[PDB]
Write a protein that binds this ligand. Structure first.
Ligand SMILES: [Mg+2]
Length: 48
RNA sequence: GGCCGGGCCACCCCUCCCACGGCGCGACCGCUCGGGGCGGACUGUCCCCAGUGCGCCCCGGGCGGGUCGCGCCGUCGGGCCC
């Protein structure tokens, strides 16, 4: 430690831009999901 | 009544720039009632069923803003009335 305290960083740049997280859904997607759920529920009733 | 010369305007021609307004034609930018091809995600129609955004590029219609913009039209317009 006394002889060499200097820190050198480790380089890493050859990384592809991969996303591991689900992106936030859009307003159009949420509205469509609500519409599909309503349609499916009405369909289930009319099948009875 | 003047007594000689100058300009400027009224007139004919042809002639430049600018301003303002209108119309049309480009090129650029921004703003989509939409069409093609891959990546996620959604629905109780789940047999290649259905529907929604997103990333790149290619087409289609309309709108506005800048454009030495470019032409045309108008001004008892302006340029010491070029
Ligand atoms: Mg003159």
């Amino acid at each position: 430690i006394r002889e060499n305290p200097v820190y050198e960083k480790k380089p890493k740049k050859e990384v592809k831009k991969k996303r591991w997280n689900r992106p936030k859904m859009s307003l159009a997607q949420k509205k469509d999901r609500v519409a599909q759920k309503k349609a499916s529920f009405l369909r289930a009733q009319e099948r009875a």
